[PDB]
């Protein structure tokens with residue numbers, strides 16, 4: 459996995475991309491949290507099958523894969539939602555049959571930040587290749603500071619090696635788009651600064667799910683491990 | 689601001705660095721007091737961060753209201769970098785995790801990360817100014833937002849310049865840049881958990897405006 463070229467690492471991420479799902483509702487009938495809850499639960503399954511295809515991820519122990527998924531899953535859903543919404547200014551495309559504006563999201567604070575992130579992606583003309591690299595970064599980075607045995611330290615070192623390889627891959631893509639060296643690292647910095655906004659949005663979202671104090675509203679270690687299908 | 693060279697960028701950030709404060713010569717009360725004194729120094733530091741005073745007072749208050757704990761936290765991690773397993777809130781206030789916890793360990797993990805990257809002082813002050821500018825639709829706000837993104841790009845150039853001066857290769861340059869900037873997601877994370885804890889017991893917009901809205 460540390461041996462793949464930048465072109466190969468991109469093609470692997472593009473072929474691993476999960477599908478866009480539809481919301482589960484009756485369109486002949488006149489409950490939003492339940493609809494979004496249900497949609498997120500079903501997206502989560504496809505995310506985990508995507509993560510398994512992220513080069514270097516299945517080199518980790520199953521325990522460490524679950525930990526990274528635990529820390530990252532909501533950021534990963536959110537960046538996909540924001541990517542999906544780039545072409546629909548003012549609205550969030552949770553699903554092709556569930557395009558919502560901010561007055562329906564009424565809570566609204568996170569909705570507004572997702573819309574802002576979608577705008578910035580849009581006016582940056584974020585490319586498909588770049589977006590799948592950013593998803594990989596979130597998966598590996600979000601849990602890397604919340605793991606200290608010997609083995610864990612080897613696992614952290616491997617995660618940092620793969621993150622360096624994703625960085626190289628992103629720069630390769632900007633180089634191939636014709637950007638100058640200065641423009642390459644300026645764009646790389648802009649894209650990583652947005653990931654900290656996405657982390658903030660995920661933090662507020664997780665804060666809301668934990669305040670529900672409801673057993674099956676935060677994916678458990680066992681639920682994620684089951685979806686990983688050892 | 690937009691005219692400064694990379695070297696003048698670093699010199700201004702270094703010139704503007706606030707002092708390390710001491711604790712008085714019961715724990716949460718001493719930490720609250722030390723943080724209250726640091727906040728005052730951080731306002732005048734922020735006024736000296738290129739691009740910042742070009743902003744409206746209202747935008748400056750919003751940026752500090754959003755970033756203040758992150759900035760406090762990155763300063764604490766920096767101060768603790770050379771003291772494995774301890775948080776140096778002040779030279780006379782060195783705590784270990786037993787005296788706290790979840791937040792403490794995250795802070796200790798960031799400190800350990802700085803150690804492994806051999807984080808440099810000139811790098812530290814660029815990262816702290818990125819936190820201020822980044823963490824937080826009238827024509828003027830659009831004009832502010834565009835200005836902030838421009839200053840952020842020059843700090844990126846300044847960071848690259850520092851690594852290039854040291855002798856790092858370009859591959860090592862973009863790799864280290866990404867490593868430094870991804871740490872910022874974790875500092876946002878810890879700030880949000882810290883806000884959560886403090887509300888379970890924070891400087892108001894008016895307090896911030898009062899300190900920032902100085903006379904001549």
Ligand SMILES: Oc1cccc(CN(CC2(c3ccccc3F)CCCC2)c2ccc(OC3CN(CCCF)C3)cc2)c1Cl
Pocket residue numbers: 494495496497498499501502532535536537538539552563565568569572662663664666667674675676677678681
């Ligand atoms: O791609 C998406 C598709 C569908 C929704 C979403 C994001 N959402 C909606 C929002 C939200 C509300 C409250 C808390 C956090 C949140 F983000 C964020 C913006 C509007 C309100 C959401 C809601 C509930 C969620 O909780 C599941 C996990 N389920 C439980 C886990 C058991 F497996 C309940 C997961 C996400 C994405 Cl990013």
Ligand SMILES: Oc1cccc(CN(CC2(c3ccccc3F)CCCC2)c2ccc(OC3CN(CCCF)C3)cc2)c1Cl
Pocket residue numbers: 716719720721722723724726760761762763764777788789791792795881882883885886890891892895
């Ligand atoms: O450099 C530092 C110097 C002194 C303390 C700190 C950070 N802290 C201590 C810790 C903490 C962090 C996050 C949340 C709660 C917390 F306990 C850090 C890990 C364990 C305890 C802290 C304590 C009280 C606080 O209360 C404000 C509101 N007050 C400001 C309102 C004035 F109007 C002070 C502000 C931060 C830094 Cl990073």
